[PDB]
């Protein structure tokens, strides 16, 4: 049933879990404090409005909660604000009593990275994927040492259609 | 006593398209990649590790239409399989 | 008739270390990553797909010594499992 | 036995293969023409000699042959020569009757990419990983469309030891 905390996520039965040395350890459900962060930019100064972004926010928020994560949702941030938010997320004490984390980024994007709210061609406002890794690594986030860190990014990575033609 | 640890480990990134290339978003239905990811997570989190789920998402994009994209898994340092074990 | 195909698909890259970081090579025994990859390929090509083998190589590097490195899988657009099926 | 063409690579039995819709198709062994390329730089103009590189060449060459690939070995190339060699490899007619390929790169390396033979800090001679993908993609190598392209790189990606300290 979809009435439970896991919603529309298909459950893993006890028999299936026993069927599954090479797996990341899962902390006790009763005491663990899983955290997830969604950063979504919808309204921009110079780039068109990202219509439908709210559907993405709703969908990802509910899914991550279904999977057991407490979800923080931050909207319409500059690359500087995104950096500050990531730094704060890395400092959260809940990670110590967590076994994993999810980070979701949704915005306009270019080849170099993810667009902040103030982005324009004249004055770039970009957050690089490299910066995300650095802020969440063992040096800057020791609490997530040995724990899976999943980064999801919705954004263009350039202007090309990503296709080529071929004949049969 | 102090011990050494890898500075970067246990990461997986999943991007909506390949480098240089666009990602699509429906005005009312939302981003295609996001919607597709949720559906696959709901279906396969019980039985598949995150890497395998991401591969399945990729496979679902294989046949290109007028709005094509190929999600890319990036910078992977997962040393183990990450199973979500939904319900536990 | 012409049909559309993804410009970039079915790639997997495997690097000897993480970005910013060194990779080690023994003067007589060779590169650690290369040697470790060969051993894992010899053992696991029969039973595991290339992605899984690369993960196993990563796991073997987990405990850092005086010369640490963490091999990284990059830019993956494999839509299927790639099994080598050695002998066939 | 290690006397066969597969050498020290453990064989996949017929029963194991049948045990294994979501797998890349394998072409007939009798007619397929699998190709692999190894580029290894050992001797440089300004960077120290890569002692032991010959052990790597031997090991990778023999392994790729064991797996069914015809291996081309090219040594001590500039980034320009590497580009020319990659372009030639992408043009090989054997890829048409192949199901997959392996590309191996072994050299000194920096954050930006792989060092050519003429590399120095004053005059960089670097091949980017991005260029390797581009030269082997569906646009520039249509013969390898839908076929696994495996890229292996032995090189530093910077000067850092890749470690951080923690206490128990």
């Amino acid at each position: 049933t979809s009435s439970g905390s896991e919603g529309n996520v298909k459950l893993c039965s006890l028999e299936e879990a026993q069927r599954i040395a090479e797996i990341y350890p899962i902390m006790d459900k009763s005491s663990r404090t899983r955290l997830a962060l969604i950063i979504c930019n919808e309204e921009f100064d110079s780039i068109p409005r990202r219509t439908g972004a709210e559907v993405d926010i709703t969908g990802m928020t509910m899914l991550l909660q279904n999977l057991g994560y407490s979800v923080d949702v931050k909207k319409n941030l500059t690359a500087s604000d995104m950096t500050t938010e990531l730094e704060a997320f890395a400092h959260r004490p809940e990670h110590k009593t967590s076994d994993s984390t999810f980070l979701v980024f949704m915005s306009h994007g270019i080849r170099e990275g993810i667009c902040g709210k103030k982005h324009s061609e004249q004055v770039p406002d970009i957050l690089q994927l490299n910066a995300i890794f650095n802020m969440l690594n063992t040096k800057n986030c020791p609490s997530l040492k040995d724990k899976p860190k999943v980064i999801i990014i919705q954004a263009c990575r350039g202007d090309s259609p990503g296709v080529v033609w071929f004949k049969d | 006593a102090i011990k050494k640890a890898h500075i970067e480990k246990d990461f997986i990134a999943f991007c909506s398209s390949t480098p240089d290339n666009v990602s699509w978003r429906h005005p009312t239905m939302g981003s295609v990649f996001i919607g597709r990811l949720i559906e696959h997570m709901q279906e396969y989190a019980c039985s598949c590790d995150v890497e395998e789920i991401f591969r399945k998402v990729r496979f679902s994009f294989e046949q290109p239409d007028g709005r094509a994209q190929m999600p890319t898994t990036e910078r992977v340092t997962l040393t183990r399989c990450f199973y979500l074990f939904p319900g536990h």
Side-chain angles (χ1 to χ4, degrees), chain A residues 31-113:
Chain A
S31 59
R32 79 187 171 220
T33 52
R34 287 186 178 155
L35 255 43
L37 169 75
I38 297 169
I39 294 171
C40 183
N41 295 166
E42 158 147 49
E43 244 110 81
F44 301 84
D45 291 349
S46 308
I47 351 177
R49 195 223 203 220
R50 283 189 70 250
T51 309
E54 214 57 69
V55 178
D56 298 330
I57 291 165
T58 297
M60 285 309 292
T61 294
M62 293 314 273
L63 165 76
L64 291 172
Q65 282 193 346
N66 292 332
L67 295 166
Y69 299 85
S70 295
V71 187
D72 283 20
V73 183
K74 306 273 176 242
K75 291 197 270 180
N76 307 316
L77 305 174
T78 61
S80 188
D81 293 326
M82 283 193 249
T83 296
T84 300
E85 220 49 68
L86 242 12
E87 224 145 278
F89 189 73
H91 277 82
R92 295 279 291 278
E94 295 101 315
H95 289 314
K96 213 202 271 191
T97 39
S98 181
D99 53 18
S100 54
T101 199
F102 277 79
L103 283 316
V104 190
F105 298 85
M106 310 187 287
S107 190
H108 281 302
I110 58 157
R111 176 68 208 242
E112 281 68 48

Side-chain angles (χ1 to χ4, degrees), chain B residues 3-22:
Chain B
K3 215 176 175 260
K4 280 181 190 214
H6 293 285
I7 194 159
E8 181 176 327
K9 198 168 70 64
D10 323 285
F11 274 105
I12 178 152
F14 197 25
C15 298
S16 46
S17 49
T18 41
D20 297 332
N21 306 133
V22 296

Side-chain angles (χ1 to χ4, degrees), chain A residues 6 8-12 14 20-24 26 29 32 50-52 55-56 59-60 63 67 69 100 111 130 133 136-138 145-163, chain B residues 5-31 33-34 37-38 41-43 46 54 68 72 74-75 78-88:
Chain A
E6 301 96 349
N8 286 315
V9 174
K10 273 190 181 189
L11 256 54
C12 183
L14 281 139
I20 291 148
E22 303 224 284
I23 298 141
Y24 280 106
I26 298 274
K29 196 193 166 133
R32 79 187 171 220
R50 283 189 70 250
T51 309
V55 178
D56 298 330
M60 285 309 292
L63 165 76
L67 295 166
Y69 299 85
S100 54
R111 176 68 208 242
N130 183 252
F133 277 76
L136 267 295
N137 72 193
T138 309
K145 180 205 186 269
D146 296 329
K147 294 152 193 197
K149 300 161 276 279
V150 184
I151 301 152
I152 306 301
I153 304 146
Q154 162 66 38
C156 285
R157 302 181 79 181
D159 287 305
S160 304
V163 283
Chain B
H6 293 285
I7 194 159
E8 181 176 327
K9 198 168 70 64
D10 323 285
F11 274 105
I12 178 152
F14 197 25
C15 298
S16 46
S17 49
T18 41
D20 297 332
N21 306 133
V22 296
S23 294
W24 298 97
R25 175 186 30 82
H26 198 287
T28 53
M29 295 295 117
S31 301
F33 168 72
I34 295 297
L37 176 72
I38 290 153
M41 285 294 259
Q42 285 175 170
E43 176 80 5
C46 61
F54 292 176
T72 305
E74 307 261 19
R75 210 160 157 167
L78 298 178
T79 58
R80 296 168 183 261
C81 297
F82 179 30
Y83 285 91
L84 257 339
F85 298 110
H88 297 113

Side-chain angles (χ1 to χ4, degrees), chain B residues 27-59:
Chain B
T28 53
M29 295 295 117
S31 301
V32 190
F33 168 72
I34 295 297
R36 202 76 55 85
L37 176 72
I38 290 153
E39 293 175 330
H40 280 78
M41 285 294 259
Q42 285 175 170
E43 176 80 5
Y44 299 109
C46 61
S47 55
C48 306
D49 70 87
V50 211
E51 274 227 275
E52 170 92 305
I53 299 162
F54 292 176
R55 187 202 50 83
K56 285 183 179 279
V57 178
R58 269 200 287 285
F59 185 79

